[PDB]
Amino acid sequence: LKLEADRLFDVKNEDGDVIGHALAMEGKVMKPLHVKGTIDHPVLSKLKFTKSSAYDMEFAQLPVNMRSEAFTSTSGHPEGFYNWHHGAVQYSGGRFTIPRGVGGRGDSGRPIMDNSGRVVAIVLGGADEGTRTALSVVTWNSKGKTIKTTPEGTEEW
């Protein structure tokens, strides 16, 4: 059996469709800015969100309590395979890549993470490079600063 904390939340549209996800990580609730909807959570949906347009990110501070049920980011990540909801992701030459036909609407927001459980990046969109989809993500470098990879022809999910 799998018992996993309160970290990934649904973001629904007007009639209720899941159009994206929001995550608890490093003391903040966060979600892609382009995802226009409401976080499906009684406490989280009422918080005041700060807009970070240069990274397609929108974040608010995790309530003192929820602070323990949260992910953790990680700077150092070599090439190789990673994990995500739909299976194995793939860091290769500075860009993550998943098979064609896997990514789609509602997949923006979910984390890509290692085997140790640290979040490497968060998904935003994808540009199809023939047989694999290159991912557009918010990732982070050695001295903290977050980077924002965006492939050519990326259509945000």
Q: Is residue 33 within a helix (H) or strand (E), and if so which, with residue range? A: none
How far CA 134 is from CA of 11, 15, 65, 126, 149, in Å, comes to 24, 30, 37, 6, 10
d(CA 36, CA 38): 7
> What is the CB neighbour count within 10 angstroms for residue 71?
19
Active site members: 34, 56, 108
Q: Do domains 7-71 and 72-157 have the same CATH topology?
A: yes
Report how far apart, in Å, the C-alpha atoms of 46 and of each of 40, 50, 63, 121, 123 are. Answer: 10, 13, 11, 26, 24
> What resolution in angstroms, rounded to 1 decimal?
3.2
Q: Which residues contact 145 (CB under 8 A, 6 or more apart)?
A: none
Alpha-carbon distance of 5 to 53, in angstroms, equals 29
Query: Is the four-CA dihedral 51, 27, 18, 153 of positive or negative sign?
Result: positive
For 7, 27, 118, 124, 131, the CA distances from 23, given in Å and listed in that order, are 5, 10, 13, 13, 29
CATH value of 72-157 in 2.40.50.140, 2.40.10.10, 1.10.8.60, 3.40.50.300: 2.40.10.10
Contact 41, 18 (CB under 8 A): no
Q: How far apart are CA 22 and CA 58, in angstroms?
A: 9
User: CA 75, CA 51: separation in Å to the nearest integer?
Assistant: 23
What is the residue extent of each domain of the chain? 7-71, 72-157
- Contact between 108 and 20 under an 8 Å Cβ cutoff? The reply is yes
Contacts of 80 (CB under 8 A, 6+ apart): 90, 91
Rounding to the nearest 10 degrees, give the CA dihedral for residues 72, 74, 117, 82. 140
**Calpha distance 154→148 (Å, rounded):** 12
> How is the beta sheet containing 57-61 ordered, strand by strand?
38-39, 8-12, 18-25, 28-32, 57-61, 50-52
Superfamily of domain 7-71: Trypsin-like serine proteases (2.40.10.10)
Contacts made by residues 89-97, CB under 8 angstroms, sequence distance 24+: 89/135, 90/132, 91/120, 94/149, 95/134, 95/135, 95/149, 95/151, 96/121, 96/134, 96/135, 96/137, 96/149, 97/129, 97/132, 97/133, 97/134, 97/135
